[PDB]
Design a protein around this ligand. Sequence first.
Ligand code: FUL
Ligand code: FUL
Ligand code: FUL
Ligand code: FUL
Ligand code: FUL
Ligand code: FUL
Ligand code: FUL
Ligand code: FUL
Ligand code: FUL
Ligand code: FUL
Ligand code: FUL
Ligand code: FUL
Ligand code: FUL
Ligand code: FUL
Ligand code: FUL
Ligand code: FUL
Lengths: 354, 354, 354, 354
Amino acid sequence: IENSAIALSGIVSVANNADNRLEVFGVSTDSAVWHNWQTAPLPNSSWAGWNKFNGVVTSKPAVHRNSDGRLEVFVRGTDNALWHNWQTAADTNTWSSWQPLYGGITSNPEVCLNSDGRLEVFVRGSDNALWHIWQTAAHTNSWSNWKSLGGTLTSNPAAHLNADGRIEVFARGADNALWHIWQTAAHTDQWSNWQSLKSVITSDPVVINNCDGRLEVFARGADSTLRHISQIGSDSVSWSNWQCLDGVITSAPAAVKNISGQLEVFARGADNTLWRTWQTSHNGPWSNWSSFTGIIASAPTVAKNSDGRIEVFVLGLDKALWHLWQTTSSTTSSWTTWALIGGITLIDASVILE
Amino acid sequence: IENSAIALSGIVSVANNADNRLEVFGVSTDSAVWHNWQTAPLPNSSWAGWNKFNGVVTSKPAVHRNSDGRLEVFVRGTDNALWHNWQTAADTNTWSSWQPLYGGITSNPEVCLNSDGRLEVFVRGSDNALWHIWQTAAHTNSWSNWKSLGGTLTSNPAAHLNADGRIEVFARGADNALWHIWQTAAHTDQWSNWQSLKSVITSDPVVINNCDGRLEVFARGADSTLRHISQIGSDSVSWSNWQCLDGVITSAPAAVKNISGQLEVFARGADNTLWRTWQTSHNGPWSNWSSFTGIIASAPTVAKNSDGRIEVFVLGLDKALWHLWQTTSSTTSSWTTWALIGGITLIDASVILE
Amino acid sequence: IENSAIALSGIVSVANNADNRLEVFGVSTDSAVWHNWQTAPLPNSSWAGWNKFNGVVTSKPAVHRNSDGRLEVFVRGTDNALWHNWQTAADTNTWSSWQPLYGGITSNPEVCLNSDGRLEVFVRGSDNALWHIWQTAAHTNSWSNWKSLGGTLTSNPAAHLNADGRIEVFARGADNALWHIWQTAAHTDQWSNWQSLKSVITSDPVVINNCDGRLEVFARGADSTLRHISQIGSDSVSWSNWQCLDGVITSAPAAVKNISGQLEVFARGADNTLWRTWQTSHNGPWSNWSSFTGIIASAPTVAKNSDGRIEVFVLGLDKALWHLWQTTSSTTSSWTTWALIGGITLIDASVILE
Amino acid sequence: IENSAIALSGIVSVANNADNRLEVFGVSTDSAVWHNWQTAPLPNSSWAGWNKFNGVVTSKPAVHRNSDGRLEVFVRGTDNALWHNWQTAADTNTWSSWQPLYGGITSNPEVCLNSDGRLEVFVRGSDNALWHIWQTAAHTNSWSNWKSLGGTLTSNPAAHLNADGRIEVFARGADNALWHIWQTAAHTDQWSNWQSLKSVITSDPVVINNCDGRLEVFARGADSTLRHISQIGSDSVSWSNWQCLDGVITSAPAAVKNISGQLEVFARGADNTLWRTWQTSHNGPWSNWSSFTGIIASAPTVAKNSDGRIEVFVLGLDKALWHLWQTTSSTTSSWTTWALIGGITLIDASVILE
Ligand SMILES: C[C@@H]1O[C@H](O)[C@@H](O)[C@H](O)[C@@H]1O
Ligand SMILES: C[C@@H]1O[C@H](O)[C@@H](O)[C@H](O)[C@@H]1O
Ligand SMILES: C[C@@H]1O[C@H](O)[C@@H](O)[C@H](O)[C@@H]1O
Ligand SMILES: C[C@@H]1O[C@H](O)[C@@H](O)[C@H](O)[C@@H]1O
Ligand SMILES: C[C@@H]1O[C@H](O)[C@@H](O)[C@H](O)[C@@H]1O
Ligand SMILES: C[C@@H]1O[C@H](O)[C@@H](O)[C@H](O)[C@@H]1O
Ligand SMILES: C[C@@H]1O[C@H](O)[C@@H](O)[C@H](O)[C@@H]1O
Ligand SMILES: C[C@@H]1O[C@H](O)[C@@H](O)[C@H](O)[C@@H]1O
Ligand SMILES: C[C@@H]1O[C@H](O)[C@@H](O)[C@H](O)[C@@H]1O
Ligand SMILES: C[C@@H]1O[C@H](O)[C@@H](O)[C@H](O)[C@@H]1O
Ligand SMILES: C[C@@H]1O[C@H](O)[C@@H](O)[C@H](O)[C@@H]1O
Ligand SMILES: C[C@@H]1O[C@H](O)[C@@H](O)[C@H](O)[C@@H]1O
Ligand SMILES: C[C@@H]1O[C@H](O)[C@@H](O)[C@H](O)[C@@H]1O
Ligand SMILES: C[C@@H]1O[C@H](O)[C@@H](O)[C@H](O)[C@@H]1O
Ligand SMILES: C[C@@H]1O[C@H](O)[C@@H](O)[C@H](O)[C@@H]1O
Ligand SMILES: C[C@@H]1O[C@H](O)[C@@H](O)[C@H](O)[C@@H]1O
């Protein structure tokens, strides 16, 4: 791989409804967003079937749950502007249809929920800078004007809350290194300058919080192995050294915190199967990668069910959506084999950043 | 103290709104529930002022946020039945007024949110057994019939979710020991038998989860010191030995998990001031109790703001509500002094269990 | 029990030879010290048989290994002075016989090894103060003059090295509380003032270091349960609160660090059997006490074999020495039943402190 | 670098005497071993001056302390056989002079102390296999015959005790991967088969134990960065994945456990200065490398003083020995600058393995 490569992304975005039922969003061969949902919040539940949102889109959809429980989806439109669509009530399959937020978008959208209940969207703009827009009141369809945070982005952005409620945003920069920028006060439009975390990355950054509040960032490195870095203090400026883990991965990673508070990472491996690694103890060393049977055609997307069981979604070689899950709510649970969520085929609508 | 004593409880119940603004509920000298809320989700925010719900009540109110963000309050009425009252929309100060759930109640109500989004209420019934009633659909005003879980209760119940979504309920039994009972499958009406955790307790039990998922229970013991016990496995049957901490406390304890994932406990101390202890490291040893200036007349009620800062509410000697909070989002932050939330005086409406 | 009680002590002192074979020292009905040793450094080894040191003694013997591997035993003599006896070469059953160190002794002797290789002995003196004497060169029979550290002692002293090489000494004071005093520079005659750790204790203090260097002190409390306190900083002045563990114990405790770095405590329980508790995780909560079959007549003395297996020694109801041990080098190993080390009967020669 | 490279080694071997004074052994321009020692066991002590052992040697010397406190040095002689030399009494500068152990040696010698007090020496033999020889009684000049453990070695061996007393030996194999072999019972001549840990290494392996007993192995990898792997169970067959740390190193690493139980690693960095990294928490993430002023010409050799302070030895550009140390017994202590231990110049006598 080259230093400027961006690893294969996940094929769907997933969210938990207010009642924790999983719901997935993807783009089909008609270039429309389709979605499907569990009928009950357990991994062995039946799924409702694929339902279409009318409208042609030009990016991967991003989904987040509002602070009042309503799902809301963000996508780039045929006019290269930002559009969004929301449930009109929590746990209800009635949606608003696509509404305009304007702007000029050159990446997939990334959504965060501020700790005061307001959604905030981050995108690469037409000048390759980071731009953002936010709800001006919690869970309300009232949005700010577009505002620039500067920088030069060469990946999609990834945002996450710090334990103290400050949003922090990660993105690859013009030098192919990981850069970040952060709110200096919780849920306020007051931001730091851009700072580099060094090290080249060859995937979008993936961010998760560990139980003790500190952010941990995962990405594929220049040698195509997983690497990670973590906060070591109580602010956004104190980080560990980068560490890599042996094993060539061929997609973006996906990280999740399991029931016991330990981190797990899933990625497509060098043999194009799903690979999994987990922390063996608190902050502990990482296990050897374990492989699941079956060739996959996307990065994994990982979610948790209402009983804590982890569930993984991938594109199959038939271009359909497949999933598998843990049989029990336990870190050492066995796993099912891949099962089909049939009815449509999916395309990778990710914005080509070049 | 005697083995059957129940320590002084907190004077208000508190919840975070959908936008994380704190809102407090207490009973005034007119025997009505009054509430007050932050106007913005920060501890130094102004408060809106005390507002009355019409209706005479006969217990401490219990409050929980629905899975769609709406607060809902539960109380015993003048007919000794259960009544409830809800926000009609998230973050909105429009309420339904008191509606009947019937039953015959002989304790304060305790509310939990199942991991499938349904509220569930636990009470001691007219036969001194544990009874419960639940929403039959998430965040919907449709409730089950009353059902008995048996047992003999001599305290109020305390409920908490396990990491795998199973509700577990704790209560003092006829022998003054701590007993518990639990769902054997997440958010399902399938329950274990009652089991004893031994050790006498002289307060209601207080339950919190630690970062690695395991429940930890705090209570005052027969010698009036704080004691605690924790789960050591991945089920509800494997517990540690009881440990006590030196220092006589004169109220129920209140526990909170701070920004760094460590536990903190607040209680009224032997000198009738607020005392605080915290874990010095992960699962680590506990600090000596630290005292805050000022005599208090209730147990503390503890909450967290949108930026992680801890805030504590108590009854003052003037019978009004006072609070103090951390100045910064840091475990070693200094604290403010007591400030008044003036406008009404409060009474302890806790059901007398004798 | 009364506040000034001192719990039953162990009946033998034990040490590892230079080759890690265990060797035990006790006092028989002739008031002489006898010793016995493993013939190979494994718990299932045969023992050599009981051998007598000529000389009448008036205290429990204390044993320590010199920095050149030679065992050295300290005891009070019929003249109430301190006497000692050493192996003339490591792993050799040739001894010097008793030699005088003079002084006037009113407790059992306690021995430490400084981190510069010099033995140092701590005793209560004729004025009830703490006195000490030391080797002036490592592993050499050249000793200092007696020197007082002041204080008023009502238990035997317990000494231990801090991680930075400073000796710290613990003893019960005139108010029945635990007091301590420490070197302010490693292996130097420069000492702090006495400071109180508060809390009454009803046994000698027992001190051990945890893997991260910090000292942890165990003792029986006024209510006859085990209590413990630990250092929380990098100095001798920062300590946690006291914690107790449920369960009445009827002897001094004995603490050991197992193969996995966790602490274990053994004591005679309320039913006069051997009880064991262990930390379930790093610094973690403590297990319920587990009981071994068999009534015992002393506190346990606990040692570790060359392969890490824990071995426990007690006085039986026949007044002989019995032991049991772990079957495998594993924290969850099963244990053998009590086996006799026959040939003599033993008496408790502990100095009566009253 | 190439896959078969072996990084620059340390220029001296170091040991603590029975009284913990440091003593260093190196080879001078006369091809003889010289040694020097602290006069007192503190890093700011004066050193005695360089003293010569008569005899020409052809490897780096290895030193270990016997279980009776006497230092013993092992070296290859002009006849390519193993020779050794010992203190005739602990903490005494009287030595036996070189005595033969015969054999045919093609690596530097590696020494371990079994948990039953017997030294054991590991070498690559004339057939490139691992060979060993041992004391047949603790701290006695009585040795076994030479015995082969097979394998094919392309680095020097590194040996360490497991927590249960089993020796485990690590060495690079014919495929440039790290291999290991272990005793299956403590201090017994019963050994496993060779097993591969995979991953290429470009330095000798460096092994240390962490506080919870588990071995951790450090080495330079094929991309010239530090990598490490650790045991995750209670046996020698369960290991983590390999992890690397960013930063090019140009020598073998040296690892030490600090006063607080955390690991630290020192190595010559890409700019030929001394670099240091440490674990920021238990098992925690690793700090960015920190650099010390001054160009160095060997790997570091790291030791601990009697008060816990870390001290580092290196070859300077003047071909003399320099050292620096911590100013206080604290993990965050500042460090001195390089100071000269003058009197001889040193050569790297490491056996050329090619
Ligand atoms: C998502 C939106 O759907 C509509 O049908 C289109 O007209 C807009 O351009 C946009 O693509
Ligand atoms: C998101 C922002 O929207 C605006 O319309 C553009 O002018 C900016 O370049 C950026 O794309
Ligand atoms: C995000 C950062 O913004 C800056 O403008 C650039 O100089 C860096 O290379 C990076 O692109
Ligand atoms: C991930 C899925 O695994 C299955 O074995 C295949 O049959 C599907 O095509 C898909 O690749
Ligand atoms: C809370 C309810 O308020 C009403 O006013 C009363 O009539 C009911 O009995 C009940 O107390
Ligand atoms: C809560 C339950 O409501 C019912 O009406 C009563 O009959 C039961 O005893 C119990 O009080
Ligand atoms: C809750 C428990 O229920 C049982 O019926 C009683 O026997 C116990 O004492 C306790 O009250
Ligand atoms: C808790 C409050 O502290 C203050 O100092 C007092 O003035 C109030 O009456 C109340 O006791
Ligand atoms: C231990 C010593 O043994 C000797 O036999 C006695 O004479 C001394 O008084 C002392 O008791
Ligand atoms: C150990 C000391 O020895 C001396 O001889 C006595 O005078 C002191 O009181 C103390 O007993
Ligand atoms: C050891 C301490 O020494 C002091 O003299 C006493 O005042 C304390 O009570 C305690 O005995
Ligand atoms: C500890 C030993 O346990 C055995 O069962 C007894 O027979 C001995 O007398 C002794 O009490
Ligand atoms: C170390 C030994 O020193 C002696 O002088 C030599 O004769 C031997 O060959 C060997 O080198
Ligand atoms: C160490 C061993 O010594 C023996 O003499 C040789 O024959 C072997 O090959 C090996 O070198
Ligand atoms: C140490 C190991 O021994 C075996 O013989 C070899 O096959 C491996 O490559 C490695 O050298
Ligand atoms: C390590 C030492 O650092 C010093 O600055 C130099 O002067 C010496 O030559 C040597 O390189």
